[PDB]
């Protein structure tokens, strides 16, 4: 039910130039997409807001697309209270030595939980700074400056075929000046 | 408390003549159960008996405050489960099994995890869809509540949890009828 | 149009709080048939099933507007007859035989006798009755309409004529059910 | 020879939203077609204005279009001095349980005449008041709030192979916005 | 520890009209009586503040008595956190097809729990909220308006041959116009 | 269904003095009962307010009353439109030669109708009209100035065992100052 | 409008021959009823019951109690007494002509309004007891009338 | 806050049967105690003890005292009548019929708060003697029941 923010330095990325003053309209669409599984066994990737198969499928219809807002959820699964684990989520820029394992000699990578009978489990909101990167993502000269999320994890001792948690992860985009396209 | 965008119906107009005074009538019914087995519920309030028996005798009926209450059972004390949830338009190719690859997506779940035993209170902000229910004509942008649970590792006899729904609604332009 | 005099029904009174708006809603029902034989109708309004599916759901109910009417059939043009009626409290020992032993009395003919062949209207000056209907309590101020004809000389297998009743009510304070 | 208005409730229905401020003019037409016969047995129907074979007849050419006045008439025949009978007349939208048999435990269904050595028999009108219903005919997205005539009666005991009374109702319309059709 | 306001509907009962501007003193006196067990068995009634035993031996020396406040508490008992179970609470007039069974079909019900070594278990105000309902309790005119406890339950799993929780529901009434009794 | 006077001539009859200005208030009670019937048999009767058996029922309690307005109504009867007959109504005090049979020869005496397939036959109200006869009824010292009905008539040609029509006649009194009676 | 005061009595009831012991409400009381019928409202005024030795009685004497009471009260015919307002007297040799008994109603005790457009429930009731023991002669003991105004208005449609 | 009245009556005890003779204190008196427990403070306004011969007594009459007297007074229940304020009357063939007896307490004699935070000794005590000789029959000969309003106040946790 809760937000935590992640620590993040000023640097923001250099953008394409512009028109007159926002040459074509545009419009905000929202989404939210399943980032990845837990539990059923060591479990440790990389996604790049750039190469969402989710993503593109709506960015796909346009040249100039840009970020808004972008948040980084952690919804916990039924089971869990009885067979907890570790996430290791971070926000950077695709462009980085950063690898799942290291999650943690970063900078704003945090260590969580999530089951248990202690503690009380419920959804974790980790809100991506986009100050600390480049907010453009399709755009017609490609960055480097991608938002990309790493979070980690260890493998289960008692993996379940089930997962444990979601990294659900959701926000806002401005698609803008069209594309072409098949149909 | 579930996300939303601004997402407005746009509904007909009243011509300047004058129009019948309403009632406000309030509502809550049972909608689902969980804890027997694999429960996709969609439900579309447009639609539902309970609260048909409370248009059909008017023409205007408009909604006005509407809470999707979620509520567990001695049972989850013991053996929990997980349930996903979102406010929608009845348009929306969503498939409770997607509950949340849709913006706005709801999920929590309750029981044996600390203070998993209490009532849960998410509504829809009525600017996501169309505030009418039964006019001149038939929308779409009526609102469709839907959830889901996978099928539970120990199935019951009895549910774990209701979701009952409740609120209440203009009625006006009186049916003229058969006393 | 019967004659009366101010007899006016004391009722209870709300409390400053606010009450929930009410809607107004219009009946008519078949209230009795002639010409099958001596037909000594009494009925209250208070407990005709016709209002009352209209009153059960909510627990302040006032009449606005009510006529008594009085229709003929394309029998009365060959086999008249006569009928008695009046607007009365359902209090009067008032027996329908005596329909017009009683201040107001009303009485004519219709069916062969140049312009029998007509509709009928009569009222009840709602002054003379208690305008409420279903309260907190139970009023006796309650209206009851009475009538009768004799037994036709000649008896038929269908009716002569109706004597539908019409009316409007404020209906408000809902009540709080079951869905 | 006369008018009697049916009483009735203010629910006018709501219509289709509108362009500029009448976007396109319109005309005024008349018509008065048939609606029912009577005397030549049981006769119980009910006529919606909306699928008035006659009135598309005219509507049919157009794509907006609503009426203004609308009549319900009652004119009695030659007979029926002799063999006397009763219709129930009724404005009602076409959208309600209403049936022939209690055109009666309605609301404004009233009880009639016409015939027998004593009534003088004389043309009868009842104006359907529009406000109780949606006025709007044809329309871009149809409505369900359509004036549809109720009217019923009883088997005779005579029939003739004649009628012994025609239910003849007039108004008018305002057929706008054209069609297309055919020739 | 705490209170939580059960959802009520504008609908104050027609009381009796008045004196002068009372014509009598009253008093303000409290009470606080038990409602009902749980846990013994199936337990689901339904109380009338009008025919409350106790209630009437304080109401029974006056002719003219209505309520001020009323509430509604749920204490928990010692058991419990080993056998959990559920109440269905709901405030409505004693004029009502509302049942214990359907306790939530109603408006206001609400479920809970109780126990369970999650839960931390503490009693539970639930305020009536007479706007809801006729204050007034005996009077010269007996009304039907009256506040009436709903709240049920299902059979336990593991019957207790004591108590489980516990209705008591307190307030405070205004008894006047006195009344006359044997001594 | 109306209205018609009687020719009256300027006669009040003289009453009892008066105490301060209305030394007791008192109430005004309305009453409404049966004339005579006709076609039985050749009716010619004559009532007076003053012994009328029923309006006693009513002054009975009292010492002081008079009365406001006294109507004579004739509500003809189902038959008649096939053994039509004829009334004479006449308004005249008590204290006169006047017999039904010359209720013509007199002043006001009117002749009527009722039945037959020619007339309407509808009810006919003829007001006494008071200002030509005593008004007050029981009073301290009685008085012979007292409203008496006439109206007479012929036996019928055929005569039927159940009425033809009725002489109701209603009004309002106004009874006042107190009696004792029995209890 | 307005209404006029009316005076009644009636026998209310013999506590004389047998055990007698009985109630009786001013509403149901077929006497006053059958005087407030004509009007479609009445409030009671002044109100007392009275009581009457028979000739006899100085033969076998008896007592009798009184007491006024709403229409509720749980009030005993026989706990009568035990209630506030509650009288008692004998009979024969002991005070028969001083004006006889006479025990009044107050009105600040109940209510009056002897039949409205409501039932009200606070209308008066009488609570007699003896128990006629020694010899139960076929001949009233005692009277026990009860005699009052009452204002009545609102015109009400009747018989005549 | 403000108190309410409220009245009462009790059968106080009967000088019949047997030589009776005793003493009542009002603080004690089980019926009113019943009816002010639920108060934390009462004082008494207006008091009466009532007198009532029983149909009997014409036969066997008898004769009572009466006296009102504070807690303490050494008022012996014989010594009565000596004390000011009291009286004496016989039964039977002598006004039994004429209002009943009755009599009175003053309030400016003793004191009232029935029952306050403390436990004043001028409460109100009666007093009355017979001597029941002649022939005890197993049914009372006298009533000396005692009424009176009373107000009381400032709520007080109780039972229910």
Redesign the interface.
């Known amino acids: 039910?809760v937000k935590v923010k992640q620590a993040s330095i000023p640097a923001p990325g250099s953008i394409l130039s512009q028109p007159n003053t926002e040459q074509s309209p545009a419009i905000?669409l929202?989404?939210?997409?399943?980032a990845t599984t837990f539990g059923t066994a060591e479990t440790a990737a990389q996604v790049s807001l750039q190469t969402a198969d989710p993503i593109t499928k709506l960015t796909a219809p346009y040249r100039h697309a840009q970020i808004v807002e972008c948040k980084a959820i952690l919804?916990?699964?039924?089971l869990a209270?009885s067979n907890p684990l570790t996430v290791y989520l971070a926000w950077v820029p695709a462009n980085s030595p950063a690898t799942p394992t290291q999650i943690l000699r970063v900078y704003g990578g945090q260590s969580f939980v999530l089951?248990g009978?202690?503690?009380?489990?419920?959804?974790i909101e980790v809100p991506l700074n986009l100050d600390s990167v480049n907010r453009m993502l399709k755009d017609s000269v490609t960055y480097t400056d991608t938002p990309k999320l790493l979070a980690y994890s260890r493998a289960p001792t008692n993996p379940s075929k089930?997962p444990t948690a979601?990294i659900?992860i959701?926000g806002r985009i401005r698609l803008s000046k069209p594309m072409l396209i098949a149909n």
């Open positions: 039910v905000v929202p989404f939210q997409f399943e919804t916990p699964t039924d209270v089951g009978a202690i503690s009380a489990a419920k959804t089930i979601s659900q959701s």
